[PDB]
Amino acid sequence: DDTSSSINFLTRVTGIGPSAARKLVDEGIKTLEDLRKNEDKLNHHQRIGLKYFEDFEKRIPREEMLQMQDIVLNEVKKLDPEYIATVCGSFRRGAESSGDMDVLLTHPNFTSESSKQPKLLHRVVEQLQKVRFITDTLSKGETKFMGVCQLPSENEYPHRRIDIRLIPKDQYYCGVLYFTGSDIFNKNMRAHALEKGFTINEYTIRPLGVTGVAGEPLPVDSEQDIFDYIQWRYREPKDRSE
């Protein structure tokens, strides 16, 4: 009812999940001013999200993402030019506007065999914080950071969502592919790969075999390699709609 209407609203809050939204309803928490008067019952994630509820509802325009992307890439280069960083999402595909920034990062020092180098990711975050670009943290793991940023005002911009994922180097390409989308695209490409005798996922590309249940990741140094494996002309991100 006009109350379910309530769980509907809550959930619009980053951090506020259903189960999580449900309880808040059992506490008599419904509107947003409810929430604001009730910070104490929210985790840090939900707090931030509530803090920036509005801003989060706005889309990001390419002219913006561009600048965003330059800040991010230039910082990372300064720490260590060996670092690889790519901004994915529709944006990579030439989208005109976006919902958030999604950065994928890797480093030759870190491969799927290592598996433990938080510093690699932290360092960048810190750097971003120090520059005044990242402004808050929603959560921050050993492999993934979820926060908020904002373009430097010279006078102001909304706060935007940003995520930085640390992926091993030997799995990066597949990963960039993957986060590049579109969804259909992925689907069709995985479909084709299969016809060719291969299985792809966001981490690897592996040859099939008898009965099907088969594998052993092939080496990938770039997106191009994946396409070559399945022998399809290479598709630039823009031609990736489907």
Swiss-Prot record:
Mg(2+) 2 binds at residues 100, 102, 163. Its cofactor is Mg(2+). The modification Omega-N-methylarginine is found at residue 62. GO terms for biological process: apoptotic process; base-excision repair; base-excision repair, gap-filling; DNA damage response; DNA replication; double-strand break repair via nonhomologous end joining; homeostasis of number of cells; immunoglobulin heavy chain V-D-J recombination. Its EC number is 2.7.7.7, 4.2.99.-, 4.2.99.18. GO terms for cellular component: cytoplasm; microtubule; nucleus; protein-containing complex; spindle microtubule. Belongs to the DNA polymerase type-X family. Repair polymerase that plays a key role in base-excision repair. During this process, the damaged base is excised by specific DNA glycosylases, the DNA backbone is nicked at the abasic site by an apurinic/apyrimidic (AP) endonuclease, and POLB removes 5'-deoxyribose-phosphate from the preincised AP site acting as a 5'-deoxyribose-phosphate lyase (5'-dRP lyase); through its DNA polymerase activity, it adds one nucleotide to the 3' end of the arising single-nucleotide gap. This is DNA polymerase beta. It comes from Rattus norvegicus (Rat). The chain holds residues 91 to 335 of 335 of the full protein.
